[PDB]
């Protein structure tokens, strides 16, 4: 299956962050980990949404918003992440990362 | 231990036909059904034993099973189609197993205006020193809304609860805004509103006490 | 016409106990398996167990076994769960999902109630309390108007919403809960009526809070 533009661009960036950043992601901020799942664009949106403090996300915040046909909004205080665990920022991209390589594997 | 895969978002323009793919290690071996579930709604089957469509579903609806990969065709694609659809098997050791579903979209619904609806604190409410004014937006896409209060002219931050939008059966987006005030408050200015800002747009319905 | 009816969520403790039920209807209840299949919200579907048709063969996930016990009795054509050392984790909506066959290696489903929401948690339940939206003509179209309920400060969802016992069903809008920063719930459900049958019909909603057991018919009248 060939790769939709928009998507191969937000594999790019993520590739970018998770590779190129030096010292840790966000410095210890902490978020919600996601699964290969259906809400998932927004899932991860919803997820990165939150920390503030970091600029080496708000490319990729900005680019997962395209994939996201609602509106998410931080602080959005739920019992939602029930299946969830909170995991590092740089982890958590790498994931969204493979998990988006992995659509392409034939 | 056996996990099914699908990629979790496709979409196609109207009527131009629409391809979702489950994975898993000899995933023919076994048989596939198709199911679709809408926001809020219990899954429906569509397939059942790879390709065996029930009573009931368009013949638009289709899949194959072959070696790795299931593959559930929806040609003629639809509007009302658009939902989340998952692969389910069963597998020996593990059971009932189910993929991760995916989101289908058709492409390019039109632009579509908020429907505005803003009440005023109950006369019970305000009997119960309590007062909640409620802003409720319907029939809009795409699902992206600010709302925003003011008092007299004025932006009220504190005390507004306020949802993420939500798919209607009928495939644009509800959300609903409420705003907490002391019986006060709203007994003591000229009136209060609530604006929703839809792309560029905006409706604001005001209201005010007798 | 095929269905399958559950019951029985609700606030739990962690570690706390929990019964379902489900109730068939519509077809040979003793010639099917059935399974219960829960789903988180957002969350895609987990299978949790199954039952043989005559009992001869139980079934259960990984993730539940030792804790969660299925259960059928043919003659009230009802499938039970009974669930024990609750997980926060195991807060989902709690489907009831019949099979294709008899045995396991036919167990997968084609008819699926319309699932019950159990959840998992340390807070406390609490009961709402309705408020009446009264009728405006403002923001709807000629001839018509707008009258409503709010569902306010209650946990945990889901909240049923009707009017006039059923029997009015159309202009009906439920819409969607709102999470508070209280960490409660609230909903608004609206419905749009001829403007002239005002003062004459009665109007009422049916709230329904089956976790907390409560109900409340609120009357909306005119301002």
């Known amino acids: 299956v060939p790769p939709s533009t928009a998507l191969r661009e937000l594999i790019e960036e993520l590739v970018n962050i998770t590779q190129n950043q030096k010292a840790p992601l966000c410095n210890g901020s902490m978020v919600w980990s996601i699964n290969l799942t259906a809400g998932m664009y927004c899932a991860a949106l919803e997820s990165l949404i939150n920390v503030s403090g970091c600029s080496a996300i708000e490319k990729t915040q900005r680019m997962l918003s395209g994939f996201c046909p609602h509106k998410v909004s931080a602080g959005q205080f739920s019992s939602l992440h029930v299946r969830d665990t909170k995991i590092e920022v740089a982890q958590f991209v790498k994931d969204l990362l493979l998990h988006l390589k992995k659509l392409f594997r034939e | 231990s056996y996990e099914l895969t699908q990629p979790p978002s496709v979409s196609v323009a109207p009527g131009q036909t629409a391809r979702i793919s489950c994975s898993g290690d000899?995933?023919?071996?076994?048989?596939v059904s198709w199911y679709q579930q809408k926001p809020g709604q219990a899954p429906v089957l569509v397939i059942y034993?790879?390709?065996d469509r029930p009573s009931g579903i368009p013949e638009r609806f289709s899949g194959s099973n072959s070696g790795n990969t299931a593959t559930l065709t929806i040609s003629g694609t639809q509007a009302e189609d658009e939902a989340d659809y998952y692969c389910?098997?069963?597998?020996?050791?593990?059971?009932?197993?189910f993929g991760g579903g995916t989101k289908l979209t058709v492409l390019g619904q039109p632009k579509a205006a908020p429907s505005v609806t803003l009440f005023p604190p109950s006369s019970e409410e305000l009997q119960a020193n309590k007062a909640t004014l409620v802003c409720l937006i319907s029939d809009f896409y795409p699902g992206a809304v600010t709302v925003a209060w003011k008092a007299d002219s004025s932006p009220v931050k504190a005390g507004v609860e306020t949802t993420t939008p939500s798919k209607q059966s009928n495939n644009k987006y509800a959300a609903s805004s409420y705003l907490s005030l002391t019986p006060e408050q709203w007994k003591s200015h000229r009136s209060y509103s609530c604006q929703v800002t839809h792309e560029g747009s905006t409706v604001e319905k005001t209201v005010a006490p007798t | 016409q095929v269905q399958l009816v559950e019951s029985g969520g609700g606030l739990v403790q962690p570690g706390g106990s929990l019964r379902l039920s489900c109730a068939a209807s519509?077809?040979?209840?003793?010639?099917?398996?059935i399974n219960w299949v829960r789903q988180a919200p957002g969350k895609g579907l987990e299978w949790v167990s199954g039952?043989?048709?005559?009992?001869?063969?139980?079934l259960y996930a990984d993730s539940v076994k030792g804790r969660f016990t299925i259960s059928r009795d043919n003659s009230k054509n009802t499938l039970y769960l009974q669930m024990n050392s609750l997980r926060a984790e195991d807060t989902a909506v709690y489907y009831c999902?019949?099979?294709?066959?008899?045995?396991?290696?036919?167990?997968?489903?084609?008819?699926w109630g319309q699932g019950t929401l159990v959840t998992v948690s340390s807070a406390s339940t609490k009961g709402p309390s309705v408020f009446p939206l009264a009728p405006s003509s403002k923001s709807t179209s000629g001839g018509t108007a707008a009258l409503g309920c709010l569902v306010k400060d209650y946990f945990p969802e889901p909240v049923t919403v009707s009017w006039n016992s059923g029997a009015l069903t159309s202009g009906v809008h439920t819409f969607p809960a709102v999470l508070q920063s209280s960490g409660l719930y609230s909903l608004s459900s609206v419905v749009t009526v001829p403007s002239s049958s005002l003062g004459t019909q009665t109007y009422i909603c049916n709230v329904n809070h089956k976790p907390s057991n409560t109900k409340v018919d609120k009357k909306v009248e005119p301002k």
């Open positions: 999902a019949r099979g294709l066959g008899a045995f396991h290696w036919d167990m997968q489903p084609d008819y």
């Open positions: 519509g077809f040979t209840f003793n010639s099917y398996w």
């Open positions: 039952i043989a048709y005559d009992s001869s063969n139980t």
């Open positions: 000899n995933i023919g071996g076994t048989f």
């Open positions: 034993d790879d390709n």
């Open positions: 389910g098997t069963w597998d020996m050791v593990t059971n009932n197993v």
